[PDB]
């Protein structure tokens, strides 16, 4: 209701109408960068001045129904002119507040939780003082996942986190990656955040490499402790220890009803046709399949038609 009424008056103005009508979805990120370039007015001093004031931070309206206005001391915790609250409110919440189970945390932040396990169950050796020469290689800071390239990691993340905004590819192939099923089964009722989960999954599944002047181990485990092993004139020895087939027939038709959503293609039929919104705005007409249409030797069989 609010978003549509906010969209309605933007097209009232002539200058914004040209932007909204002449810009394709492919160019949103281009115009997103035209914001500003001057903000650094000594942030440390600003924060020091802002922490002196009472009520320096903001919160939602429903805080007034969960946190009392005053504590046993008799100090005000929030004030009414989003509302304004004080750090004492955060400390009060950490002291008294509702509790919920945290069983989903070790599966969303497991890449961080493996580091502590590696560090605690490790042993140390002696330190040697001498001079050494360091040469450069290609090092991997994120190992990634085996049997998965960078093309399908994004597909997996999109399917798990944003099931309603997949398009074209992933929607016409006839397969289902195994890891997707377990990721969707485990994260059934997690309410942390879509964006945080997406970033954590990207960090877990995607491999990325850089250049470093390493003079010791090459594996990913030895790169994360590179500030502890090497130095200007010393070396420390340390061991770690341890989705059905569909096709596009054309654009939207006015003789086959209104458009649907991707999650509502489940009912469907055995070869009817309906229009749906796929991706970030495209509406196309689709239909179920009747054959295989695979990538077997039939592609190579065309060689019989040539070189007779």
């Amino acid at each position: 209701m609010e978003r549509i009424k906010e969209l309605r008056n933007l097209m009232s103005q002539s200058r914004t109408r040209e932007i909204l009508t002449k810009t394709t979805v492919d160019h949103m990120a281009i115009i997103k960068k035209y914001t500003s370039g001057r903000q650094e007015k000594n942030p440390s001093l600003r924060m020091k001045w802002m922490m002196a004031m009472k009520y320096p931070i903001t919160a939602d309206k429903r805080i007034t129904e969960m946190v009392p206005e005053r504590n046993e001391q008799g100090q005000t915790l929030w004030s009414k002119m989003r509302v304004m609250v004080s750090p004492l409110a955060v400390t009060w919440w950490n002291r008294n507040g509702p509790m919920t189970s945290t069983v989903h945390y070790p599966k969303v932040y497991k890449t961080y939780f493996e580091k502590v396990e590696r560090l605690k169950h490790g042993t140390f050796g002696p330190v040697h003082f001498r001079n050494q020469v360091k040469i450069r290689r290609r090092v991997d800071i994120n190992p990634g996942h085996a049997d998965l390239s960078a093309k399908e990691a994004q597909d997996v993340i999109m399917e798990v986190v944003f099931p309603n905004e997949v398009g074209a590819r992933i929607l016409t192939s006839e397969s289902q990656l195994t890891i997707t099923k377990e990721k969707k089964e485990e994260l059934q009722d997690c309410k942390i955040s879509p964006l945080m989960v997406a970033y954590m999954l990207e960090r877990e599944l995607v491999r990325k490499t850089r250049f470093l002047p390493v003079a010791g181990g090459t594996s990913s485990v030895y790169i994360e402790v590179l500030h502890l092993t090497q130095g200007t004139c010393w070396e420390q020895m340390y061991t770690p220890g341890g989705r059905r087939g569909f096709l596009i027939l054309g654009k939207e038709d006015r003789r086959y009803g209104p458009a649907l959503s991707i999650n509502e293609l489940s009912n469907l039929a055995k070869g009817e046709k309906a229009n749906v919104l796929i991706g970030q705005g495209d509406v196309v007409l689709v239909m179920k399949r009747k054959r295989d249409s695979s990538i077997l030797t039939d592609s190579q069989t065309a060689t019989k038609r040539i070189r007779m």
Binding site: G167, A168, L247, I248, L249, R291
Partner: peptide
């Protein structure tokens, strides 16, 4: 169906 295959292939390649 044959036309739909071509259209889908071209759409996916463009995307």
């Amino acid at each position: 169906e044959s036309r739909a295959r071509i259209k889908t292939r071209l759409f996916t390649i463009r995307q």
